[PDB]
Design a protein around this ligand. Structure first.
Ligand SMILES: O=CCCCC[C@@H]1SC[C@@H]2NC(=O)N[C@@H]21
Ligand SMILES: O=CCCCC[C@@H]1SC[C@@H]2NC(=O)N[C@@H]21
Lengths: 131, 489, 489
């Protein structure tokens, strides 16, 4: 069914079930045996032209993380100078009656000095420094 | 045979003809004019005539529906315009004005052609006038694949949507040489007018793509949404999705605490059909979301706040973004669906020093002037003038709905308690703010006054939206006679 | 009998009724509604009913021509709006929509009335919708005599012109208490939204007056210019001045050096009739002048650059100012006269970081969309896209004129010489820049192409303008059918 997950396919006797995650019209996100892949489905022109396309490399920066917006820090989660893993919440600012929660996108460890509780300073300061 | 394009591809770049071939259907492009020369006769230009004269204009066909397009050529004279280049574009736009067909242009010009004198200015003026006259008649989309400098930048600006390519494109009015000459600062071309700058800082570019191939692939998808002309109806496509699909996950999206945040996409995605959202300006003014989507196989317009970013507070940039989206959607008879969650306007001196009064009025003007069917859903809160601006029932709204835990009040409980009791006995906070929030920060009063049609379970939103949007298919409303409005610029 | 107004005058302030009496004719005001109560029945408001309910609405008559007006009252409840106050204003605006009459309002409200709940929001929404619908049908003028805070600020914004009183008026969206609460900065009310701030920084206020008496006296003079409605013709008044008055002082205004500055008012004043200029926004974006004036007894619109300030360079603020003026002038069929002297656009990073591309397109859109008769005079220079924007002949201009020492070129001589000779032998400056400026920085080439009708002596400008404006009295031009445009916001 269009835009749905389950996809039942049966060649001869063999039967398989795959899943359809999403796409950007050149790359298809399909699941095979409980694993995500990205298959490219392109015609003759797109195939012959995709060779002549720049492939830039994104910035790989392991450095201090700053608070996007002003606020107040009410709760902290991580400890100064210990291990940090991707997807871990680090602290929570509260602004105009709203608690956000900036986390650690991706890294192994940190070296820094924690901003103490109730420090209504923010203004894009260095709350946690990753080194 | 791959002649004369090896020099181009060696620089990791594509050609105009290749871009045109990628955009349209496999074999449905008919180039209109191909043997035209510049006839300049100045500054040693009497030689080196070119057959195509740096432009490729044709008709093409996308998804079985007609289109018109033109593409600049960087190899020939740097893509400069002339008295002769602009004639082809003018002819294409005039033909696409007679017939109800849109126009899409891939800009690559390096600037004006100096060897023609003021004829380049003449051509620019003609193109500007055609864009001005035909805006609101046929949709216009522009993509910038390479450099775009000088006064040629203005014609993409008048167009409805402008997209940018990441690595090898930029746009600005004046070059960095003049900036160094007058101010004395050394800034590179990318640092001045790169795609990121216009994606985040200036708000001109409506999107950014990583490659030309992806740009074409998604431009086709965007084109699948648009109506063909001003008088043609909104397209409807077949779809296996149905209004009876169960959405009970909406009962739990809103947290029971009033100070916790949530993602509005968790409310947007269930209501619309699967994998049918095309966000517009995703990296600019993130506190508001705008884009296109389909509901039961017909394209609609989506405008919702987001408490994830800055508590979902209206601002200057958000106001401009929403105003432009609403104006375009209404110009071509596209239904509008809005989700409301706003505590007010962003407070700060910089805001008044930047003219919040002008900018915030644009969204209100766009919402009030609109005559397309509107549907509004109030999830959690709506305070002060923000409630009025975000498509309130009094602005000729068709149907308005609220969720059982909503709040519609003049302002927060603290300010109301302060103003209602000047020098009342101390500790008044505890036994007054709670009571006022209990009694008047609830949708019961607004429902008593008649400002919301009904209070609904969050699981019935898809059913209600499909029913209302099906019933409202044939509304005919007209404004008083005017030559045109006077919007607060 | 001077009862109950002694308390008001003691604070060096006037009353609403006194302001109304000062505005209209001596005995031609007929108050419409005077015995109306709030019928609230909440928070101990069942008592202290007021007969007028804080508003004075009537009809009046100015210079023998009808008008409609309303005035807030600060003594009664602080001027707060309600479900009942807004009804009178809605009735007045609806009546002034049926009949071709304008509306003028003197705002003094302290904010919304909390004791009514969401009914104040309902009234605000109704007033906003009426302003949105009737903008471009009848002219709307607003004057702010006292405090104006909260969401009530938006209705003056949609109105065509907003004026301010110096000592005792201010306007902003959010009070300084909230600013202190969130940001922590202590700013006074005047430092936040005083008349100077909106006169110079935000660009919202169209003027400032020293006293209420002077405000009324000059508001009458402004009203003498406007047409009564959308369909009524431009007013023409008797005048002893004649087109045959000698103006030979224009031969010497332009200095013979290209780097010396002059005042454009020395060119503006001789052409128009004596003592008939009403500048709009005099203290904001001084590099451009906009206002109203009379030519042979009929009101026209004036838009001219000024090389006195910043070399007469177009900018963001100037673009917004000119765009709003042109849009208003065209909406009501008022002729436009422009004087051109521009070297280009202002170069700087802040400009691109602030969106020059969006703002500079607004003036071009306003000039191209307009259908009223246009007259353009190029005094000294016009370069690049600035020449295109400032009402060039290709944008359906009626008549264009130039002065004998004008210059119309693609860009300055230095840049052209640089681009036309990449690595040409050194010292090329002396024998190339002079030659290029001599050969192509002159109106002869632009006249050969046909972009200026004729090259005239500066002493004939009044004669030519009067002749053309008399002949063009009955032009009928129409744009293609649209629900409305899509201007770059
Ligand atoms: O209570 C003090 C600060 C409350 C601010 C509440 C939000 S912040 C922005 C917006 N403006 C308001 O007046 N309220 C909201
Ligand atoms: O020659 C170097 C600086 C020339 C600037 C000339 C004026 S300044 C602003 C405007 N932008 C231009 O490109 N030219 C004018």
């Amino acid at each position: 069914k269009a835009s749905y997950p389950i996809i039942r396919v049966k060649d001869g006797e063999a039967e398989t079930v795959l899943q359809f995650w999403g796409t950007n019209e050149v790359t298809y996100g399909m699941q095979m045996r409980g694993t995500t892949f990205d298959v490219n489905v392109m015609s003759d022109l797109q195939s012959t032209l995709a060779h002549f396309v720049p492939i830039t490399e994104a910035t790989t920066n392991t450095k201090q993380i700053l608070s996007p917006m002003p606020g107040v820090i009410v709760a902290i989660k991580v400890q100064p100078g210990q291990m940090v893993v991707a997807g871990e919440e680090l602290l929570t600012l509260e602004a105009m009656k709203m608690r956000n929660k900036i986390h650690a996108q991706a890294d192994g460890k940190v070296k820094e000095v924690k901003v103490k509780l109730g420090a209504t300073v923010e203004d894009n300061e260095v709350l946690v420094e990753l080194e | 045979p791959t002649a004369a394009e090896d020099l181009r591809h060696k620089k990791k770049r594509l050609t105009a003809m290749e871009r045109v071939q990628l955009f349209c259907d496999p074999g449905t492009f008919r180039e209109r004019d191909a043997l035209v020369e510049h006839e300049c006769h100045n500054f040693g230009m009497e030689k080196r005539k070119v057959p195509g004269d740096g432009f490729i204009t044709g008709t093409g066909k996308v998804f079985g529906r007609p289109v018109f397009l033109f593409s600049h050529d960087f190899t020939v004279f740097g893509g400069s315009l002339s008295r002769t280049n602009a004639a082809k574009v003018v002819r294409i736009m005039e033909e696409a004005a007679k017939i109800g067909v849109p126009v899409i242009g891939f800009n690559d010009s390096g600037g004006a052609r100096i060897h023609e004198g003021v004829d380049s200015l003449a051509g620019y003026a003609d193109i500007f006038l055609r864009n001005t006259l035909f805006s609101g008649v046929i949709p216009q989309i522009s993509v910038i694949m390479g450099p775009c400098a000088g006064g040629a930048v203005y014609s993409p600006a008048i167009t409805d949507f402008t997209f940018m390519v990441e690595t090898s494109s930029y746009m600005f009015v004046t070059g960095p040489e003049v900036v160094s000459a007058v101010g004395g600062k050394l800034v590179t071309k990318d640092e001045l007018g790169g795609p990121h700058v216009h994606a985040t800082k200036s708000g001109v570019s409506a999107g950014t793509f990583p490659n030309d191939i992806v740009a074409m692939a998604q431009l086709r998808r965007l084109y699948s949404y648009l109506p063909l002309s001003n008088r043609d109806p909104v397209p409807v496509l077949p779809t296996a999705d149905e209004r009876y699909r169960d959405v009970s996950s909406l009962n739990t999206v809103v947290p029971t605490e009033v100070k916790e945040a949530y993602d509005m996409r968790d409310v947007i995605y269930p209501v619309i059909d699967h994998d049918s959202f095309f966000e517009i300006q995703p990296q600019f003014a993130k506190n508001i979301i705008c884009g296109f989507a389909r509901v039961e196989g017909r394209s609609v317009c989506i405008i919702a706040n987001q408490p994830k970013v800055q508590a979902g507070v209206l601002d200057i940039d958000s106001s401009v973004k929403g105003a432009r989206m609403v104006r375009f959607a209404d110009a071509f008879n596209i239904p509008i669906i809005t989700f409301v969650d706003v505590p007010g306007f962003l407070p700060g001196v910089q805001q008044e020093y930047g003219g919040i009064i002008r900018h915030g009025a644009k969204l209100l003007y766009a919402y009030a002037e609109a005559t397309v069917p509107k549907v509004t859903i109030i999830t959690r809160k709506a305070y002060g003038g923000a409630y009025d601006v975000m498509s309130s029932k009094h602005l000729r709204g068709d149907s308005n709905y609220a969720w059982p835990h909503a709040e519609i009040a003049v302002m927060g409980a603290a300010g109301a308690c302060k103003l209602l009791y000047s020098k009342e006995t101390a500790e008044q906070q505890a036994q007054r703010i709670a009571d006022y929030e209990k009694t008047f920060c609830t949708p019961l009063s607004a429902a008593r006054k008649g400002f919301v049609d009904a209070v609904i379970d969050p699981s019935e939103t898809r059913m209600r939206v499909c029913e209302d949007l099906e019933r409202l298919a044939r509304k005919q409303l007209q404004n008083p006679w005017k030559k045109h409005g006077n919007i607060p610029l």
